[model samples]
Target: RGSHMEDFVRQCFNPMIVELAEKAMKEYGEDPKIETNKFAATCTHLEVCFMYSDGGSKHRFEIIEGRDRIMAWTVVNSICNTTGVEKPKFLPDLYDYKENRFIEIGVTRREVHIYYLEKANKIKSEKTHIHIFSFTGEEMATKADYTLDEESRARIKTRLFTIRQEMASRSLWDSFRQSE
Candidate 1:
């Protein structure tokens, strides 16, 4: 069981995280530093730290959950765009909040991969209704699913904006130049 989880993270989670970081840099003009910690004897949980800079403002999103880890990253990206913090690339333009449906985008071996939750109305149960699609639009194996609450989203967005304001107010570059 542990081996499977570790494999999933290596093959699936790591690739997605890498792609997101690249997108953040190329499109949003942000430099992202990704730190991934795999499972070990002392530490059983897998942890990932996504640290990035928006101009002078720095932000970080930590994902330590054993399951639905990708969704957590996606939520962070979505919140950034929704709050006007910064516009990151790669996610779909239209998101269905009412239906609790969203797409997780990634690339593996030069192939685009998409994981989406099926229509919620069709099934009342919450037992993972995710559909996977590859670059050629062919359906692949299924995966787990998860969602975030509006209140938490709002809280995160507020914190991000606050950090941006605090950092933007100070001039680190100016101080460096003055010292020179």
Candidate 2:
């Protein structure tokens, strides 16, 4: 399942997507200040709290990939929250599917955070900042919502509806919806 999602990301996060996002940001929203990596170390540390956890693994990766976890969480959570029974259908004109657009744009947004974190770590001098985004996990949802253009918003909503429908048919959304 993770691999499939990864594949979706690989296919959709093309250069054009980034370019469009950049253009949208340049034209819209009051770009907010973003804080740097918050749970970077905490998430890695908790992985070692094994037996205290579900007790599935004796060891974890030494170099933890927290960014991947953050990205996945954002996408899955949005899917969980969306209304069930809609499919991915691209429209020549757009507006109503902001949910779907968020799911797709979110993948790239997550990638940007991951990249910024890496750069911040490497330089260790100056800070790396993402426009219309905060590296700190807390701001992701709001960042996505306020920064995207109307077109992007519509796309996001559409994708989210599709995601929920897919999950609902498989009864995955049952668990997610219950949690919400």
RMSD of each: 18.9, 21.5
lDDT of 1 by residue, 60-121 (tens): 22222222336745764766566444332333222333333333322111122322333333
Clashing pairs counted in every model: 0, 18
Pick by TM-score: which candidate is best?
Answer: 2
Model 2 C-alpha RMSD vs. true structure (Å) is 21.5
lDDT of 2 by residue, 144-164 (tens): 344334454344445444544
Which pairs of residues have clashing backbones in candidate 1?
none
Predicted model with the maximum lDDT: 1
State how far residue 155 of model 1 sits from its true place (Å): 1.9
